[PDB]
């Protein structure tokens, strides 16, 4: 009598169904223990962590997080790890929930071009993080080597309408947030736990806009929530909703009716959500600068009838979500590609600036640049802008306060500095503004902003 | 059948009673669902975050945290948000516990001089954070835009003798801890989660000394504990006591008999305390440098009979609480004002130095400067001090070790450096010491300390 | 009727049995309340925080964490604190679980050479942190002044086969991780919560290798887990296993069947582990850079029969644990001593480099330097190494990529930079490699690495 003692494996071996985020393999739907064969392949590959920002990820199965594994408590798992011949590093795995030293690390050590296997019985029901366990472990985990394995209870989880896979991670780029180009891993930021990005599913906007999760009013949604870390603890929160329940790993304790829950580094939870009114529900790390300054936001979008007795308000918009209220920011991807190619047009910059202007600028100056007479000066046919377009660069970088006059109206207010914006973002935003609302046109270049940022 | 389905509103509309911290509105004390009208006004205003340190807070209702809202599960809330015409920024609100996208953010968007409303049914019982949800959200939250809303269970919470409102926040000033003057918000420290202050209720000493919470031996105290963040998770702890219970948001789980509990960023809990012996109980973030180096301490002061069989010890003092054992440090406020005015007297400095000397210096050199023969040299009629008063500045900033002689007694010990003290604090402490215990008198200036700090 | 109201003390006074980590005093094994006399002495002393790295710890009872205290709920504790005459600082104590202001702080204030006492009834059952409460509190806690006190329930905890004492802390050295020499406390890193070390029981390798905790297959292990902080929250995790249960302080909630659990700063928990298969189980802070870059790993080593049906895999090794897979790194201690003495031999460096080569280098280049043809170039009789031994220093510090040829085989791969290695570590590793596998011999000095690190 160990736990998860259900018998020796019966029937034929089952090849495990591994899914890519944000999807989950189907419930095993069986009453007997099985020998489950898992084949997982490590791939090292460049992917976009943000628009026009590439990163060399180390992946289980080509994604961050890695492929989702689903087995049944009592199963015997024969775990095959392949390391693709293109890999430069060796890799291995530690699966939380494994009973044995290293969670499989020693026996799963796998050089590029090789394959390893070890076998384990899944004694422990629950949701568990797996990750690479190769020195230096922090580097392998920071580069994206984590995912979830579910060990079902023998009777399976209660049925829901949808099951999704969401995994938080902290990332450490040499360059700053949204600085374009291929970004190396930064060991110094990693050791200090100062990530440049905090993401769901390996990228900014991975689960926003046209990539949101979906359900309908009345449906139940189970989310398998991982925190791969490596270093951060998530104040994991759903905006505008509540979790019916939150259960950590294989724990006996189940919390019900909470909105904010702490997920340890390396931790995992199953949360349940019941859709009650339509609109966009935001999954965040409520350490707010992560959610709103580093990418740590995901969307569950609910379709169906409004319930005015429950909520009279409008759908989420750019005031809260900023530039992620849109379907995508693919104009920024295209403008960055054109810059690298030396083929950047005015229109490339305009469309990029339009994407970034949302929230960042429109919260005060409005979508149409009209502002609000006497409170927020207009950017639309702005005489003050026209009178010295170049100074707009200083205003964005270093802010503006004091008495000014715009389209012959008096303002005495404060525009905070926005120095975190990269040279290309300032250039594109300002090029957008100059080419909108009958402004004079022309363009601002990243190089122009670089020169101004460097002026003391 | 949604939750909190108690009927349509009955009776007349109720104007919500909003309280300022640390007080709470009274229990709604009713058996029927109501239409509750809430009017909350945003005010941007300078307040003292520390003695002689001003900060431009963004507030719900003129305080940090913002006004406390109390309604009943099943109530229909008509939420009016006004943004005062003096505001420079637009603002809005996201109330945790609201069922709907953004927790009210889109419909509550409110320019300076304007008013917005949206309606929501309070389906979810519990204690919930609300906060501003205006891009850039981290900035609005960092500037103080958070508070708590309680949704009572339909039968109301159990009666206690006292209900208080305590909310932790992390703050990001350009200047260092206790550097005097009007301190701007520092976006860089905020993004990096490196706060200069960690406070309860928007200021150092907000809940210490003459501003402590009160109760008596035998009474029960309920505290509504918020963490507005934006970024920090509180290792929330009561020194010298225990919580009878800790309940997060609307959760079904209630923890009992704990002293230390983790509150997520954006999280809230109700804690219960039973006073058993008199004295000062300290609420801290037990990430100790926050509690003892950044302001994260609050006091619950208990009156009544000593129980020597339970505790024989003395009341908290300056050894633990340092300069917050006193009623206030208002001498520091007055000395800083006089400096700005150019009217700083020797006595202004003396009284300021006396406030700061407690804990900081008195732990070793004693309240009376006598020290302890052969262990801690005296500052009282100190020949070593008199022999070169100027060098006292180097001793405070950079510490002192090695063999010295003072009032013809031998010392060979270590005075740690105290370089975190600002120029004005060193000047005032040393001016206090020179004017006490028959020392030679004179004064040390901030400018003198500035010159020494700059010497290599 | 207060809690823990079991009567007045009966029988003779009991002198409390205090143990040194990782051991625990025996169960009190009694059915009556007692007067328990505790005598705890503060000692300030240099100890090795890492091999060849000394730190001036401030200790309760000569260890970090301090001596373990065990009493029974309902006991009257007469607490004597002595501060050894060698101390330079005054000290005192705050015991979590004490009912009274400061947890004993005011009455336990104790100058060097003095003794204090206060009395308290242990009303609250549970595991509790104690720590020093002397301004500046963060400094005293950072220097090691914490431990655990257990208050047993009146019937005692359930019997287990083993009880161990593990306490996490964050430490703040002026120098970087593994920089040799006597390291001062760094107030700036402490205030910023940027520790250089994160340790169990006051040192790197305190609970690894020949110092691992032990049990056998089938036995139950209770671990009293403290987090003294001062600042960090532990994502406390056991690699390759599960906790049967996790109970915080005196809480009524008990979590069962979890692998990862958040321990607040100043928090404590009792965890239970049932050994099911042999090998090394790693206790970590799963904020991974702490566990793998700063020292936050401890071992529970299980003896007994392999269960191939549960786990087919091999024992933990250097791939995961790196240089802590070995019994000790005492060659590094000896090489550092010899350097300070000016008697550093080639063999001293070789044996030190051999200790550090494990994981750090062997994960790719193998234990025998053979590498893996076409993937990892060999260090064994390496023509590329021999061709310019000096350049090996640049390769270690700054990494190597691009097409190279070694023992006439083509490589085009990436060796990451390893700039975190100190001058002495690079020197010793390279001296080890030059003196192994028929390489040319010679030696590299710390001074050689210093010059290269400084080259731009
Ligand atoms: C509200 C917090 C604002 C955000 C976000 C942005 N701007 Fe702004 N801007 C704002 C104020 C209150 C003022 C007037 C400052 C004063 O001294 O009273 C401004 C000013 C400008 C100007 C110059 C005036 C004009 O042409 O109307 C420009 C060109 C401008 N702002 C542009 C701008 C851009 C491009 C932004 C996004 C990057 C942006 N602003 C944000 C208030 C706020
Ligand atoms: C205990 C940790 C101390 C605190 C806090 C402060 N001081 Fe100190 N001081 C201390 C020691 C052990 C010594 C002797 C150092 C040695 O080499 O043995 C000192 C020395 C001084 C002196 C010079 C000697 C004298 O005049 O008595 C001065 C002027 C002094 N200390 C002042 C001082 C002030 C103003 C402090 C608060 C800012 C302070 N000290 C803190 C021990 C400790
Ligand atoms: C895998 C991540 C590695 C670790 C850890 C270390 N090394 Fe390495 N090394 C590696 C590769 C893929 C290469 C070839 C780089 C290329 O451009 O293809 C290297 C190269 C070296 C060399 C030069 C070649 C040789 O002599 O074989 C030396 C001297 C070397 N490496 C030494 C070295 C030492 C001492 C390490 C621990 C500090 C170490 N390496 C780690 C891959 C990896
Ligand atoms: Cu890997
Ligand atoms: Cu892990
Ligand atoms: Cu706001
Ligand atoms: Cu929120
Ligand atoms: Cu101490
Ligand atoms: Cu404490």
PDB file of N, CA, C and O in Angstrom, chain C residues 286-325:
ATOM      1  N   UNK C 286      12.403  27.321  -4.709  1.00  0.00           N
ATOM      2  CA  UNK C 286      12.157  27.093  -6.150  1.00  0.00           C
ATOM      3  C   UNK C 286      12.105  28.423  -6.901  1.00  0.00           C
ATOM      4  O   UNK C 286      11.871  28.388  -8.140  1.00  0.00           O
ATOM      5  N   UNK C 287      12.424  29.544  -6.250  1.00  0.00           N
ATOM      6  CA  UNK C 287      12.934  30.702  -7.012  1.00  0.00           C
ATOM      7  C   UNK C 287      14.371  30.283  -7.384  1.00  0.00           C
ATOM      8  O   UNK C 287      15.285  30.459  -6.585  1.00  0.00           O
ATOM      9  N   UNK C 288      14.498  29.710  -8.575  1.00  0.00           N
ATOM     10  CA  UNK C 288      15.527  28.719  -8.978  1.00  0.00           C
ATOM     11  C   UNK C 288      16.921  29.315  -8.869  1.00  0.00           C
ATOM     12  O   UNK C 288      17.840  28.591  -8.478  1.00  0.00           O
ATOM     13  N   UNK C 289      17.088  30.594  -9.156  1.00  0.00           N
ATOM     14  CA  UNK C 289      18.444  31.173  -9.086  1.00  0.00           C
ATOM     15  C   UNK C 289      18.910  31.157  -7.630  1.00  0.00           C
ATOM     16  O   UNK C 289      20.108  31.161  -7.410  1.00  0.00           O
ATOM     17  N   UNK C 290      18.004  31.125  -6.653  1.00  0.00           N
ATOM     18  CA  UNK C 290      18.437  31.035  -5.235  1.00  0.00           C
ATOM     19  C   UNK C 290      18.996  29.629  -4.989  1.00  0.00           C
ATOM     20  O   UNK C 290      20.124  29.484  -4.449  1.00  0.00           O
ATOM     21  N   UNK C 291      18.272  28.620  -5.431  1.00  0.00           N
ATOM     22  CA  UNK C 291      18.609  27.199  -5.186  1.00  0.00           C
ATOM     23  C   UNK C 291      19.919  26.836  -5.916  1.00  0.00           C
ATOM     24  O   UNK C 291      20.765  26.129  -5.342  1.00  0.00           O
ATOM     25  N   UNK C 292      20.122  27.362  -7.114  1.00  0.00           N
ATOM     26  CA  UNK C 292      21.171  26.880  -8.030  1.00  0.00           C
ATOM     27  C   UNK C 292      22.260  27.916  -8.244  1.00  0.00           C
ATOM     28  O   UNK C 292      23.308  27.515  -8.745  1.00  0.00           O
ATOM     29  N   UNK C 293      22.050  29.179  -7.878  1.00  0.00           N
ATOM     30  CA  UNK C 293      23.108  30.210  -8.029  1.00  0.00           C
ATOM     31  C   UNK C 293      23.519  30.816  -6.688  1.00  0.00           C
ATOM     32  O   UNK C 293      24.529  31.524  -6.689  1.00  0.00           O
ATOM     33  N   UNK C 294      22.775  30.588  -5.598  1.00  0.00           N
ATOM     34  CA  UNK C 294      23.080  31.303  -4.336  1.00  0.00           C
ATOM     35  C   UNK C 294      23.192  30.381  -3.130  1.00  0.00           C
ATOM     36  O   UNK C 294      23.386  30.924  -2.040  1.00  0.00           O
ATOM     37  N   UNK C 295      23.018  29.074  -3.277  1.00  0.00           N
ATOM     38  CA  UNK C 295      23.251  28.099  -2.200  1.00  0.00           C
ATOM     39  C   UNK C 295      22.019  27.468  -1.611  1.00  0.00           C
ATOM     40  O   UNK C 295      22.190  26.724  -0.629  1.00  0.00           O
ATOM     41  N   UNK C 296      20.811  27.771  -2.109  1.00  0.00           N
ATOM     42  CA  UNK C 296      19.554  27.410  -1.401  1.00  0.00           C
ATOM     43  C   UNK C 296      19.137  25.973  -1.776  1.00  0.00           C
ATOM     44  O   UNK C 296      18.091  25.772  -2.409  1.00  0.00           O
ATOM     45  N   UNK C 297      19.962  24.997  -1.380  1.00  0.00           N
ATOM     46  CA  UNK C 297      19.726  23.548  -1.556  1.00  0.00           C
ATOM     47  C   UNK C 297      20.177  22.742  -0.327  1.00  0.00           C
ATOM     48  O   UNK C 297      21.255  22.979   0.262  1.00  0.00           O
ATOM     49  N   UNK C 298      19.337  21.804   0.080  1.00  0.00           N
ATOM     50  CA  UNK C 298      19.649  20.896   1.198  1.00  0.00           C
ATOM     51  C   UNK C 298      19.256  19.489   0.751  1.00  0.00           C
ATOM     52  O   UNK C 298      18.357  19.357  -0.113  1.00  0.00           O
ATOM     53  N   UNK C 299      19.875  18.472   1.323  1.00  0.00           N
ATOM     54  CA  UNK C 299      19.609  17.078   0.917  1.00  0.00           C
ATOM     55  C   UNK C 299      19.068  16.261   2.086  1.00  0.00           C
ATOM     56  O   UNK C 299      19.666  16.273   3.183  1.00  0.00           O
ATOM     57  N   UNK C 300      18.014  15.508   1.797  1.00  0.00           N
ATOM     58  CA  UNK C 300      17.546  14.349   2.584  1.00  0.00           C
ATOM     59  C   UNK C 300      17.912  13.103   1.769  1.00  0.00           C
ATOM     60  O   UNK C 300      17.363  12.948   0.648  1.00  0.00           O
ATOM     61  N   UNK C 301      18.819  12.270   2.276  1.00  0.00           N
ATOM     62  CA  UNK C 301      19.343  11.083   1.552  1.00  0.00           C
ATOM     63  C   UNK C 301      18.684   9.833   2.107  1.00  0.00           C
ATOM     64  O   UNK C 301      18.754   9.623   3.339  1.00  0.00           O
ATOM     65  N   UNK C 302      18.030   9.064   1.252  1.00  0.00           N
ATOM     66  CA  UNK C 302      17.221   7.877   1.650  1.00  0.00           C
ATOM     67  C   UNK C 302      17.990   6.603   1.264  1.00  0.00           C
ATOM     68  O   UNK C 302      18.394   6.471   0.118  1.00  0.00           O
ATOM     69  N   UNK C 303      18.164   5.713   2.233  1.00  0.00           N
ATOM     70  CA  UNK C 303      18.823   4.395   2.059  1.00  0.00           C
ATOM     71  C   UNK C 303      17.736   3.335   1.904  1.00  0.00           C
ATOM     72  O   UNK C 303      16.713   3.452   2.563  1.00  0.00           O
ATOM     73  N   UNK C 304      18.007   2.295   1.123  1.00  0.00           N
ATOM     74  CA  UNK C 304      17.132   1.116   1.106  1.00  0.00           C
ATOM     75  C   UNK C 304      17.023   0.541  -0.283  1.00  0.00           C
ATOM     76  O   UNK C 304      17.851   0.875  -1.154  1.00  0.00           O
ATOM     77  N   UNK C 305      16.024  -0.302  -0.472  1.00  0.00           N
ATOM     78  CA  UNK C 305      15.834  -1.073  -1.712  1.00  0.00           C
ATOM     79  C   UNK C 305      15.225  -0.164  -2.793  1.00  0.00           C
ATOM     80  O   UNK C 305      14.269   0.569  -2.502  1.00  0.00           O
ATOM     81  N   UNK C 306      15.739  -0.250  -4.016  1.00  0.00           N
ATOM     82  CA  UNK C 306      15.139   0.375  -5.224  1.00  0.00           C
ATOM     83  C   UNK C 306      13.777  -0.273  -5.493  1.00  0.00           C
ATOM     84  O   UNK C 306      13.630  -1.463  -5.192  1.00  0.00           O
ATOM     85  N   UNK C 307      12.791   0.508  -5.946  1.00  0.00           N
ATOM     86  CA  UNK C 307      11.467   0.004  -6.393  1.00  0.00           C
ATOM     87  C   UNK C 307      11.304   0.371  -7.869  1.00  0.00           C
ATOM     88  O   UNK C 307      10.881   1.468  -8.184  1.00  0.00           O
ATOM     89  N   UNK C 308      11.752  -0.503  -8.749  1.00  0.00           N
ATOM     90  CA  UNK C 308      11.825  -0.259 -10.209  1.00  0.00           C
ATOM     91  C   UNK C 308      10.432  -0.029 -10.776  1.00  0.00           C
ATOM     92  O   UNK C 308      10.344   0.649 -11.740  1.00  0.00           O
ATOM     93  N   UNK C 309       9.395  -0.588 -10.177  1.00  0.00           N
ATOM     94  CA  UNK C 309       8.005  -0.362 -10.615  1.00  0.00           C
ATOM     95  C   UNK C 309       7.596   1.095 -10.353  1.00  0.00           C
ATOM     96  O   UNK C 309       6.685   1.576 -11.029  1.00  0.00           O
ATOM     97  N   UNK C 310       8.224   1.765  -9.396  1.00  0.00           N
ATOM     98  CA  UNK C 310       7.890   3.177  -9.024  1.00  0.00           C
ATOM     99  C   UNK C 310       8.845   4.127  -9.744  1.00  0.00           C
ATOM    100  O   UNK C 310       8.405   5.190 -10.186  1.00  0.00           O
ATOM    101  N   UNK C 311      10.116   3.784  -9.805  1.00  0.00           N
ATOM    102  CA  UNK C 311      11.138   4.659 -10.411  1.00  0.00           C
ATOM    103  C   UNK C 311      12.321   3.827 -10.860  1.00  0.00           C
ATOM    104  O   UNK C 311      12.969   3.200 -10.001  1.00  0.00           O
ATOM    105  N   UNK C 312      12.636   3.899 -12.148  1.00  0.00           N
ATOM    106  CA  UNK C 312      13.707   3.112 -12.790  1.00  0.00           C
ATOM    107  C   UNK C 312      14.972   3.946 -12.850  1.00  0.00           C
ATOM    108  O   UNK C 312      15.967   3.417 -13.253  1.00  0.00           O
ATOM    109  N   UNK C 313      14.912   5.213 -12.489  1.00  0.00           N
ATOM    110  CA  UNK C 313      15.992   6.161 -12.777  1.00  0.00           C
ATOM    111  C   UNK C 313      17.149   6.084 -11.771  1.00  0.00           C
ATOM    112  O   UNK C 313      17.037   5.465 -10.695  1.00  0.00           O
ATOM    113  N   UNK C 314      18.230   6.754 -12.122  1.00  0.00           N
ATOM    114  CA  UNK C 314      19.458   6.802 -11.317  1.00  0.00           C
ATOM    115  C   UNK C 314      19.341   7.920 -10.287  1.00  0.00           C
ATOM    116  O   UNK C 314      18.546   8.879 -10.490  1.00  0.00           O
ATOM    117  N   UNK C 315      20.196   7.779  -9.274  1.00  0.00           N
ATOM    118  CA  UNK C 315      20.468   8.738  -8.187  1.00  0.00           C
ATOM    119  C   UNK C 315      20.850  10.084  -8.805  1.00  0.00           C
ATOM    120  O   UNK C 315      21.461  10.138  -9.854  1.00  0.00           O
ATOM    121  N   UNK C 316      20.419  11.142  -8.166  1.00  0.00           N
ATOM    122  CA  UNK C 316      20.844  12.530  -8.452  1.00  0.00           C
ATOM    123  C   UNK C 316      22.354  12.569  -8.694  1.00  0.00           C
ATOM    124  O   UNK C 316      23.096  11.950  -7.952  1.00  0.00           O
ATOM    125  N   UNK C 317      22.788  13.433  -9.580  1.00  0.00           N
ATOM    126  CA  UNK C 317      24.217  13.586  -9.901  1.00  0.00           C
ATOM    127  C   UNK C 317      24.508  15.055 -10.221  1.00  0.00           C
ATOM    128  O   UNK C 317      23.657  15.961  -9.998  1.00  0.00           O
ATOM    129  N   UNK C 318      25.712  15.281 -10.702  1.00  0.00           N
ATOM    130  CA  UNK C 318      26.312  16.621 -10.904  1.00  0.00           C
ATOM    131  C   UNK C 318      25.533  17.374 -12.006  1.00  0.00           C
ATOM    132  O   UNK C 318      25.767  18.570 -12.129  1.00  0.00           O
ATOM    133  N   UNK C 319      24.760  16.686 -12.863  1.00  0.00           N
ATOM    134  CA  UNK C 319      24.017  17.370 -13.962  1.00  0.00           C
ATOM    135  C   UNK C 319      23.062  18.369 -13.310  1.00  0.00           C
ATOM    136  O   UNK C 319      23.069  19.495 -13.711  1.00  0.00           O
ATOM    137  N   UNK C 320      22.349  17.950 -12.275  1.00  0.00           N
ATOM    138  CA  UNK C 320      21.366  18.772 -11.535  1.00  0.00           C
ATOM    139  C   UNK C 320      22.057  19.535 -10.377  1.00  0.00           C
ATOM    140  O   UNK C 320      22.024  20.767 -10.345  1.00  0.00           O
ATOM    141  N   UNK C 321      22.664  18.829  -9.426  1.00  0.00           N
ATOM    142  CA  UNK C 321      23.268  19.411  -8.191  1.00  0.00           C
ATOM    143  C   UNK C 321      24.600  20.108  -8.464  1.00  0.00           C
ATOM    144  O   UNK C 321      25.083  20.719  -7.526  1.00  0.00           O
ATOM    145  N   UNK C 322      25.220  19.917  -9.637  1.00  0.00           N
ATOM    146  CA  UNK C 322      26.499  20.563  -9.957  1.00  0.00           C
ATOM    147  C   UNK C 322      27.561  20.194  -8.935  1.00  0.00           C
ATOM    148  O   UNK C 322      27.690  19.007  -8.603  1.00  0.00           O
ATOM    149  N   UNK C 323      28.284  21.177  -8.432  1.00  0.00           N
ATOM    150  CA  UNK C 323      29.474  20.920  -7.584  1.00  0.00           C
ATOM    151  C   UNK C 323      29.066  20.434  -6.188  1.00  0.00           C
ATOM    152  O   UNK C 323      29.978  20.103  -5.421  1.00  0.00           O
ATOM    153  N   UNK C 324      27.777  20.289  -5.892  1.00  0.00           N
ATOM    154  CA  UNK C 324      27.322  19.829  -4.560  1.00  0.00           C
ATOM    155  C   UNK C 324      26.898  18.359  -4.599  1.00  0.00           C
ATOM    156  O   UNK C 324      26.472  17.821  -3.530  1.00  0.00           O
ATOM    157  N   UNK C 325      27.041  17.707  -5.746  1.00  0.00           N
ATOM    158  CA  UNK C 325      26.843  16.237  -5.837  1.00  0.00           C
ATOM    159  C   UNK C 325      27.927  15.506  -5.014  1.00  0.00           C
ATOM    160  O   UNK C 325      27.589  14.568  -4.293  1.00  0.00           O
TER     161      UNK C 325
END
